[PDB]
Amino acid sequence: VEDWDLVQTLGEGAYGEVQLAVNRVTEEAVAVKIVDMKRCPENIKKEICINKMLNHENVVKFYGHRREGNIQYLFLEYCSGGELFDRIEPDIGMPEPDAQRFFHQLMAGVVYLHGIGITHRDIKPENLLLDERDNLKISDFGLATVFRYNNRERLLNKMCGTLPYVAPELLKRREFHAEPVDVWSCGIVLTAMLAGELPWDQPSDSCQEYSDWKEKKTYLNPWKKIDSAPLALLHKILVENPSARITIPDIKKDRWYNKPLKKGA
Length: 265
Ligand SMILES: NC(=O)CSc1nc2ncnc(N)c2[nH]1
What we know:
The protein is of the alpha+beta class. Helices cover 29% and strands 18% of the residues. The longest helix has 20 residues. The structure holds 2-[(6-amino-7H-purin-8-yl)thio]acetamide. 2-[(6-amino-7H-purin-8-yl)thio]acetamide binds next to loops. It is found in: Nucleus; Chromosome; Cytoplasm; Cytoplasm, Cytoskeleton, Microtubule organizing center, Centrosome.
C-alpha cells in the first residue's frame, strides 16, 4: 500500500512486521519492514543509519526509508530463499558442502561489517537469508552497533543477542570486545548447520552441556555428528577466553575452511 502492494506477511516479529511488497507497474518485489514508532524511535534511527552505511553482496540491501506518520517503512532486498533456519533439518543439519559454502558467505559478510566498524550482535540462522541463487545475506541491523570509529575501538557493555548464540564473556564481563562475540555466534551457527541442534541453552558454568564441552567430551551429541575437520575449527571458535579465540583472518586459513567439497552451479 505504498506505490507497491503488500501481498504477503514475511516475518511478524515484535517491532512490527516484514511484508513482501510488489510494484504493480514493474512487478518488482521487495521486503518492507513496518515499524509503528508508537507500539521505539531511538534504535530505529540507528537501524536505518547503520543500514545506509551498508553495501555488500552478503548483507541484505537497503533501498530507502519513508516516515508516513508514526509508521517507518524500511525498504529491503527481498530474499526469495527464506531463512537459513529452514534448510537445517532438526537433528541432522545439512550436507557438509552446503554448510561450508554458507559459512564462507557468512564470514565474507562478517569481515565486511567488521571492516567498517559495525557489529551485528545477533547472528543466528533466523537472521541469515537466502537470495534466489541461495546466496547468504546477513539481515536485521536492529541490534547492530558501531564498535570502531575514527580507528579507535570501543568495548561494548550492553548485553544483547540470543542466549544459545551469545559468547560467555558477554554473560561474565562488564565490557568486552565486539569482534570475538560475532565470531563465537558464527561457530554456533556452524554447529547448528552440521548437527541440526544447538549445543547449550547458554554458555554458563551453570549449564551442563557447556561444562561438557570445556571438558572436551566430544563423544556426546552435538559434536559426535560433526566430523573431525569442521570440529577442529569449532574447537578454535568456541574457546571461552575471547583473547585466545581464533580470529577471522585465522579462520580463513583453517584446514576444513579451505577443504574442497562442492561443485559449481
Ligand atoms: N522480522 C524481521 O526482522 C525480518 S523477516 C524478513 N526480512 C526479509 N527480507 C527479505 N526477504 C525475506 N524473506 C525477509 N524476511
